[PDB]
């Protein structure tokens, strides 16, 4: 039977023989008969060696088929296993890593005993959250999976097959879940990404893994966050500025809880207070620890009440990034442009605490602010006074995000935008402008 | 030709030697070439069941078709066992066939030490003698594909799909200048990069021509169905940039040929498919004139209630076998002909007798189909149009999506490499082939010396040439009806809202729909599924159950 | 003529208004509807069986419980 | 350019409702004439951007708001009907 | 399928939906991912964040009254304080309070026997006969800590009582540990000797007819006429006529 595989590590080659004077079919009929006249052939290969020069046809008899990877059954959508050097060609139909029908009568005892390939780095079971069978669902449609058959050559030492598959997921950052099942012929190790399926309700917050066809033992990398914790307040490396100095808070959705590491009031442009009024973003360069543990004042709006309170000002260009603990590794970001009124009066809570859509959806929320009124959107003539102030400040925030969100743990190719009521008229303009694909700001739009 | 006519499995040899003599008896075969279980006479006044090789059993000759006779397994399992009782010498083998009558794939004796895989006809597959339990058995393709590679003639692999069963359309290549079979297990191997497109293939073999033909589940060619598809004017596709697949099957050179084969078979046979097991048995019964002609209800499956000529009558499942609780002389019976109330009555009564208080009884058309396909403007391009001039059969559109897109691995790739929906017919058939076969610019894509004999097909129509009605088999061809469907089918693919129908057809789970034709089975059925009533409602059925 | 009546089939005990049939855990084996414990010369190690498997030569601990893998040991450990 | 779109209005989105905070400072100093002049200036904008009478008299029939005489019951509601189906929805 | 904690521990590890202590206004140091046993008890002295506190089984809240007090001691202060109410004052023993296995209410209604968790074994008594439920006094076979899913009632006469929600696989004989030099006889109380029950899984009938042998009188047809050529010829002819087969309608098909 042909294996559905194209690369093998831990190979144990029993015999090799070149053949080029025969045809393909007649040369293949020699190649089956040679493994037949070998009492502990497990299977044979049949492939061109040195295909980069167009090399000749071999019939290499194998003793063991150690680990079998890069299956041709997930397509090529998600590879974490290198599928061979381009010098063998196990691709064309008469060629193939073939094996015998695996009889329960094994190879007789005079054959040289085979070993698994040795693990490079020593793995520990303490660095892998073991999970139960009652916490997954079979989903025969998921497509970011991988598979690696480890054959029944290692009859004993199930824990050495396990330490070999976990030593492969520990080398790749894309793999986060390792499920492996024994079966008649191999130990089928599979590999996944962070494939969760939570069922949010009011009486609880249950979560469980998405899996293709189930396995016995399930192993998972633990959660990790890119946020430091001194005195249990969060901080984060900004690229060229330094560290922020944020705030932590536990929130309630139904009956369960989640820590959201709220960095409120993060600046992204210079304050247009006086004579920087009616000019520009003018990007600011601070350095050190920015005190980011409180909301900032919002912008002056048409219809502003006369209460000159520290909740409204002109310098509102400040972001409120709301991050759950242990997000998805390449996370998702929602940019939400919303200045607010003075109906709240310096209470210390944000007018839209966007950390709940962050928590329930396992994503990052950057609640934004932008100049509305006459302090922005003031055009005159055909000169330097342009009249897109606040509208070019939305670019000043979206470029802050897709530069500095790699520190917070996000992914600036899944980042969205959304505006509230009438700002959605003036924040839909960015979807119109055709720009370079390498510098596209968002990727969704609500 | 003769590679299946010399191993004609001599039931079919004994038909033609008896049919030409003008005799009152002729033996009746199955589609494979084996004898049927029940043999009859031409007048239908004496039917008797037969052994393996044409010899009848020693007394079952009922004046009429028997109620039940013995399968080829249980013929052999009695014949071995009484030979171990008359001669009293034991033989350490007896078959272990299932309820269907044919052999189980795994076969061994009572001690169960060497269990091997066997062919469905009966002969032992040479090589797979394991020591106790085969994990999988080879099917009819992979046996024929490997014995080919050992070298018993015909150097071109009878390609197959995913379990070793033959695909119904088989395309082999041939040089016209010698009329010998083109070597394909070597030319796909020795020249891989020559098989990118047909323009890159015809420049490497300027004498070869494609030869596609229908075939049964045994791999042998059906009689008078072979086409010789020319491949000169086939242009390139957008699928050239992808890598070459493993075998010849998944190559884009193969799937264009089966689409060009079955699109011709639509205007010839009225089916966008090869004929199934029902339609082959109906043609070979009408040809030799013997009784028990089957009935096929336009879907390829067997029509349920089947009567023979002026005799007893019964009903049949979708496999060709008799339902044992029915043999009614006179009127035809009523076997499950939309009688699903009495089964559905039992689900309401078991929901009626389930505790109290609605703790679970709430949670006791499929889901996510009624509110995505039949409501959201996606089915409305299909069963709708401008006027009455379609007669578009919906066991042709669910055959149209099935044969054009055979699996979900194509619907993702055809949608990912498509920007303009008007370009979709170009990179799917290799041209604008539906209006070339609708408005008949196909003289140049086909050719002579393919076993269909176009000339004796056009004389009963008198419309045109290349150089009621009966099609490739006993079929009715309203050719005006068939040409109007393919004009609609080309306009179906030139829509932005078919690509958005095809995107949601990928997201259908596997258990509710196996193939994309089964997606078209459920969606065309879910348009009538009104939402389920209140859970405590129970319908009322008749005596037999008729809602 | 005994009519139709419920039972359990593969390797399970049958206890006698509901869910009465029991998994037959390890240390035992289903012979004929009554899961007899596995004899002293063998061991079972997994629930719901027909028979129990041998351990290497001259190995048990006490009796026909035959609990798990570390219960066929030599008489070196039966020295008392 | 590939970006998915999830779009949608409310039923409450009126330009009277978007000017709820605008009325509050007008009520503070006190200008009752800044409401009846606001609706007609909104009715002035109800047609085209050039305030064509051929569209403004056409659309003021269709929402049937030609009763700016005695009450602001039907005249204030049906104006919000008209602006929302041209500025919002 | 998971318990009240293994479902919550999964939510704590996978997507950080932690629980909280005291529910009033929890700081993020007051949250915890639940740590639990092989069964879903909440595993006394579970800890995360600020430090280590103690949480009673079957309820994720902490046992608010050093070492955290035992289950009898918090339930005695839960019944006498009248916040929880099974229906009796619990009876601790004088040191390391588990459950002293003579448990009954005011005015001696009905006294019954406990497990380690405190639940009924079952098998209860009325105050005319005080239920003697003591130690086994014989060691368990194969070095077992305790028999899972039950205790050992002893009247100087010991047997296995499977818990409420299970059945003993073999019938528990009235075994004897009446100071018999610390051993059993003729049967051992094996570990794992009770499993949770499960629904009926096969259905079967019988049938009766006879052949009425035509060739005279012949019960000499015995050699290869009992298991060979019969039980098989009557079986092929039974399934050729179609009686080893149920074919019913799943909505048409
Ligand atoms: C595996 O290796 C064998 C041996 O190298 C490959 O077979 C060789 O394939 C090349 C083409 O790639 C053939 O060359 C051709 O020769 C003919 C003349 O015979 C010439 O007209 C062509 O232009 C071309 O140069 C070569 O003959 C052939 N050799 C044999 C012995 O078959 C084979 O293709 C390799 N397999 C794969 C899948 O690449
Ligand atoms: C098998 O596993 C055990 C336990 O992990 C280990 O001590 C032993 O070395 C392994 N055997 C081999 C040959 O690696
Ligand atoms: C996140 O995306 C980047 C894109 O280059 C990739 O390199 C990285 O491995 C991804 N991380 C995870 C954990 O998927
Ligand atoms: C901040 O640094 C950048 C570095 O390129 C510089 O161009 C910019 O002028 C600086 N901002 C100010 C206000 O000087
Ligand atoms: C049937 O007859 C043929 C010869 O015509 C013979 O080869 C074959 O073995 C026979 N089969 C049986 C089952 O008698
Ligand atoms: C064995 O029994 C068969 C039964 O048909 C009989 O024909 C045959 O003559 C017997 N003897 C031999 C030598 O085969
Ligand atoms: C087909 O037949 C002609 C006959 O001369 C020959 O030249 C040609 O090479 C043949 N095709 C192949 C594949 O060899
Ligand atoms: C059929 O007609 C079309 C349109 O004129 C033309 O492009 C095409 O080449 C014709 N087909 C053939 C085979 O000449
Ligand atoms: C405004 O629209 C709603 C839509 O439901 C309608 O019911 C209402 O009558 C409209 N208002 C007026 C004043 O006509
Ligand atoms: C049982 O095993 C434990 C270790 O698991 C050991 O400490 C003890 O001595 C053994 N024997 C008895 C009688 O408990």
From Swiss-Prot, chain D:
The modification Diiodotyrosine is found at residue 72. The modification Iodotyrosine is found at residues 39, 72, 86. The modification Thyroxine is found at residue 72. It comes from the Eukaryota. Glycans are attached at residue 81. Iodinated on tyrosine residues by TPO. Sulfated tyrosines are desulfated during iodination. It is found in: Secreted. The modification Triiodothyronine is found at residue 72. Changing residue 39 to F: Severe loss of thyroxine (T4) production. Abolishes thyroxine (T4) production. Specifically expressed in the thyroid gland. The cholinesterase-like (ChEL) region is required for dimerization and export from the endoplasmic reticulum. It is linked to Thyroid dyshormonogenesis 3: A disorder due to thyroid dyshormonogenesis, causing large goiters of elastic and soft consistency in the majority of patients. Although the degree of thyroid dysfunction varies considerably among patients with defective thyroglobulin synthesis, patients usually have a relatively high serum free triiodothyronine (T3) concentration with disproportionately low free tetraiodothyronine (T4) level. Belongs to the type-B carboxylesterase/lipase family. Acts as a substrate for the production of iodinated thyroid hormones thyroxine (T4) and triiodothyronine (T3). The synthesis of T3 and T4 involves iodination of selected tyrosine residues of TG/thyroglobulin followed by their oxidative coupling in the thyroid follicle lumen. Following TG re-internalization and lysosomal-mediated proteolysis, T3 and T4 are released from the polypeptide backbone leading to their secretion into the bloodstream. One dimer produces 7 thyroid hormone molecules. Monomer. Homodimer (via ChEL region); occurs in the endoplasmic reticulum and is required for export to the Golgi apparatus. Homooligomer; disulfide-linked; stored in this form in the thyroid follicle lumen. This is Thyroglobulin. The chain holds residues 2502 to 2590 of 2768 of the full protein.
